[PDB]
Enzyme design. Structure first.
Site, PDB file in Angstrom:
ATOM      1  N   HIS A  41       0.800  -1.213   0.000  1.00 47.50           N
ATOM      2  CA  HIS A  41       0.000   0.000   0.000  1.00 47.50           C
ATOM      3  C   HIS A  41       0.845   1.281   0.000  1.00 47.50           C
ATOM      4  O   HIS A  41       0.270   2.384   0.063  1.00 47.50           O
ATOM      5  CB  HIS A  41      -0.996  -0.010   1.164  1.00 47.50           C
ATOM      6  CG  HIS A  41      -0.378   0.108   2.523  1.00 47.50           C
ATOM      7  ND1 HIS A  41       0.040   1.312   3.055  1.00 47.50           N
ATOM      8  CD2 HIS A  41      -0.158  -0.821   3.482  1.00 47.50           C
ATOM      9  CE1 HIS A  41       0.513   1.116   4.271  1.00 47.50           C
ATOM     10  NE2 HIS A  41       0.402  -0.169   4.555  1.00 47.50           N
ATOM     11  N   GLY A 143       3.637   5.963   9.934  1.00 42.09           N
ATOM     12  CA  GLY A 143       4.980   5.823   9.430  1.00 42.09           C
ATOM     13  C   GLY A 143       5.665   4.529   9.799  1.00 42.09           C
ATOM     14  O   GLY A 143       6.705   4.224   9.216  1.00 42.09           O
ATOM     15  N   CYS A 145       4.733   1.435   9.260  1.00 41.02           N
ATOM     16  CA  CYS A 145       4.537   0.282   8.397  1.00 41.02           C
ATOM     17  C   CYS A 145       5.855  -0.119   7.741  1.00 41.02           C
ATOM     18  O   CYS A 145       6.733   0.709   7.495  1.00 41.02           O
ATOM     19  CB  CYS A 145       3.471   0.576   7.341  1.00 41.02           C
ATOM     20  SG  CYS A 145       1.783   0.449   7.958  1.00 41.02           S
TER      21      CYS A 145
HETATM   22  C1  LIG Z   1       1.588   2.199   8.082  1.00 43.01           C
HETATM   23  O1  LIG Z   1       2.626   3.141   8.293  1.00 43.01           O
HETATM   24  C2  LIG Z   1       0.316   2.485   8.909  1.00 43.01           C
HETATM   25  C3  LIG Z   1       0.292   1.955  10.362  1.00 43.01           C
HETATM   26  C4  LIG Z   1      -0.924   2.319  11.258  1.00 43.01           C
HETATM   27  C5  LIG Z   1      -1.196   3.804  11.428  1.00 43.01           C
HETATM   28  C6  LIG Z   1      -1.176   4.075  12.920  1.00 43.01           C
HETATM   29  N1  LIG Z   1      -0.729   2.827  13.520  1.00 43.01           N
HETATM   30  C7  LIG Z   1      -0.582   1.801  12.666  1.00 43.01           C
HETATM   31  O2  LIG Z   1      -0.220   0.659  12.941  1.00 43.01           O
HETATM   32  N2  LIG Z   1      -0.804   1.879   8.190  1.00 43.01           N
HETATM   33  C8  LIG Z   1      -1.955   2.459   7.813  1.00 43.01           C
HETATM   34  O3  LIG Z   1      -2.265   3.620   8.036  1.00 43.01           O
HETATM   35  C9  LIG Z   1      -2.922   1.502   7.088  1.00 43.01           C
HETATM   36  C10 LIG Z   1      -2.893   1.575   5.539  1.00 43.01           C
HETATM   37  C11 LIG Z   1      -4.072   0.817   4.884  1.00 43.01           C
HETATM   38  C12 LIG Z   1      -3.966   0.863   3.345  1.00 43.01           C
HETATM   39  C13 LIG Z   1      -4.297  -0.629   5.363  1.00 43.01           C
HETATM   40  N3  LIG Z   1      -4.324   1.668   7.509  1.00 43.01           N
HETATM   41  C14 LIG Z   1      -4.661   1.729   8.855  1.00 43.01           C
HETATM   42  O4  LIG Z   1      -4.002   1.233   9.770  1.00 43.01           O
HETATM   43  O5  LIG Z   1      -5.811   2.420   9.035  1.00 43.01           O
HETATM   44  C15 LIG Z   1      -6.402   2.468  10.335  1.00 43.01           C
HETATM   45  C16 LIG Z   1      -5.793   3.570  11.202  1.00 43.01           C
HETATM   46  C17 LIG Z   1      -5.021   4.580  10.602  1.00 43.01           C
HETATM   47  C18 LIG Z   1      -4.465   5.595  11.386  1.00 43.01           C
HETATM   48  C19 LIG Z   1      -4.687   5.609  12.768  1.00 43.01           C
HETATM   49  C20 LIG Z   1      -5.450   4.610  13.378  1.00 43.01           C
HETATM   50  C21 LIG Z   1      -6.006   3.592  12.595  1.00 43.01           C
END
Ligand SMILES: *[C@H](O)[C@H](C[C@@H]1CCNC1=O)NC(=O)[C@H](CC(C)C)NC(=O)OCc1ccccc1
Ligand SMILES: *[C@H](O)[C@H](C[C@@H]1CCNC1=O)NC(=O)[C@H](CC(C)C)NC(=O)OCc1ccccc1
Lengths: 301, 301
Positions: A41, A143, A145
């Protein structure tokens, strides 16, 4: 003596962390040999994450759309593919710090260390267990991921996890290093429910043995129990059923302490029905289940 | 989201670990530039350790009595000196992996990462606080002496602890890298005991703040309290007095959450007076005191 939640030394994994930027999405990647592995992603945009079609978004990209930064050294992307939910970026330089490694898919109940990274730089190291519902209780911010979870054996790093997302309940989800999610999750920005979680019984028993090995004996008793009569109680408290394979794996700890596995099960049964009544075990007022039998042996003696 | 006991990435310290052998005593040493630091009790034998005169034991040693191994490579000892309880062994090779570093003595209540080591090989990494009684609750087996505690700041590894021994209660004692013990302990196999411990109030508050930052508020209340009024309840529960300097340090966390320090103190006061009623905070049924305010800000941001 003493008993701590202990991670593997992270040096070998630190030397593998890089930054991967695509458009205005930046996450972490794993540089092993001339390949960089990262969550697919990274190619998505803010509005593309709602429900992406990754094969479409990827066919519209070329090598020069991926900025890979190794510290200051920018690596050249000379290839790319997609394996399930991970991107594999072929690069011109082979990582000189590449360790002996494997890619493994760990089972629920097993533990691993996580190197939390942002923009390609390690922030900290901690232990997680893969929960029975295929989530992990991590510490992951925007950040993070592309951060990996791993075990070390001899000089070999077995990579078992790459971080992709946080669920609404605050627990975390991701894939093995071949891109297959642990659990029934997908890499789309949509609310997803983990299954009901349960306690890893064999791990609780190992930790009780760790406690005895360390001199915590107040919870022992003279009673014993059958495996069936024990699992009847565990079911009520949402504990994983205990099998003879689990009983067999606790063998070594039973032998070291002289306490039979089913005798320890009688202890656990009592602890479950009556709580601890203001006492603690190895500094927790809760029954800890993120220690495997292997974790207990490695740290006791 | 999520909050874990998190260690610093340990790669820069793994590169400094070596094995030191004298007679049939083996422990770990810290190789920085052309000097190897280790506990002086490595020059003791079985009988020596009961009541040793280290000056008298060390004068009797030659350089070639010291076997130092960095991986496979033997390192030749070309000098030696004793500084308090630490041995400085000059060697014929400066460590090529020497990082930017300093030696510092930490204060009670501060935290650091421990790289547990055996036979010069890193084994694991975990977080420790220096208790108010100058012990640490570590995880250490025979062979672990010479393992070091440290923090990292930008590029600089600050070494603050070297492991020497375990006390009868199962906690651990050691020195700074100048060889001066933390606490009233000595490096000999005699009867000694840790003083009475207390809870690090400022840290408990830092952790309640982490709990709010991560979305949890069940323990807050509408009440408030004066510093003196709070500290009267603290003394009753074996908590360290809270000072205005603690309050000032908790400022930034107070600001990010909109909860006044003294208001969080009334929450803590109610938590101490009532307990938790079966609830948990950040997954613990106990009030956690091994996170500083800096630890919280660093992990939550
Ligand atoms: C990757 O860097 C990131 C990790 C999340 C963000 C906050 N804590 C984490 O573990 N991944 C994403 O934002 C991810 C991307 C999608 C295409 C699957 N989506 C996600 O985790 O969304 C839910 C969310 C986002 C931000 C804060 C809390 C939940
Ligand atoms: C140094 O490698 C070792 C570390 C101890 C061993 C068990 N856990 C630790 O932290 N230090 C010693 O053995 C020390 C030697 C003195 C002469 C400084 N004495 C010590 O820790 O005595 C108590 C003890 C020894 C062995 C097992 C349990 C407690």
């Amino acid at each position: 003596s003493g008993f701590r939640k202990m991670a593997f030394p992270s040096g070998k994994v630190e030397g593998c962390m890089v930054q991967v930027t695509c458009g205005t999405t930046t996450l972490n990647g794993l540089w092993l040999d001339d390949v960089v592995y990262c969550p697919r992603h990274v190619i998505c945009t803010s509005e593309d994450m709602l429900n992406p079609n990754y094969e479409d978004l990827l066919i519209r990209k070329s090598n020069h759309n991926f900025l890979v930064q190794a510290g200051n050294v920018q690596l050249r992307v000379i290839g790319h593919s997609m394996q399930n939910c991970v991107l594999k970026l072929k690069v011109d330089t082979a990582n000189p710090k590449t360790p002996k490694y494997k890619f493994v898919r760990i089972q629920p109940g097993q533990t691993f260390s996580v190197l939390a990274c942002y923009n390609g730089s390690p922030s900290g190291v901690y232990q997680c267990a893969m929960r029975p519902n295929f989530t992990i209780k991590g510490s992951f911010l925007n950040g993070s991921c592309g951060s990996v979870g791993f075990n070390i054996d001899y000089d070999c790093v077995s990579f078992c996890y790459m971080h992709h997302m946080e669920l609404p309940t605050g627990v975390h989800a991701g894939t093995d290093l071949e891109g297959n999610f642990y659990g029934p999750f997908v890499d789309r920005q949509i609310a997803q429910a983990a299954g009901t979680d349960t306690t890893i019984t064999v791990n609780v028993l190992a930790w009780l043995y760790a406690a005895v090995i360390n001199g915590d004996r107040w919870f022992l008793n003279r009673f014993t129990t059958t495996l069936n009569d024990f699992n009847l109680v565990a079911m009520k408290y949402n504990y994983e059923p205990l099998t003879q394979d689990h009983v067999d794996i606790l063998g070594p700890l039973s032998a070291q302490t002289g306490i039979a596995v089913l005798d320890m099960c009688a202890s656990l049964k009592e602890l479950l029905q009556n709580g601890m009544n203001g006492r603690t075990i190895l500094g927790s007022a809760l029954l800890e289940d993120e220690f495997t039998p292997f974790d207990v042996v490695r740290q006791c003696s």
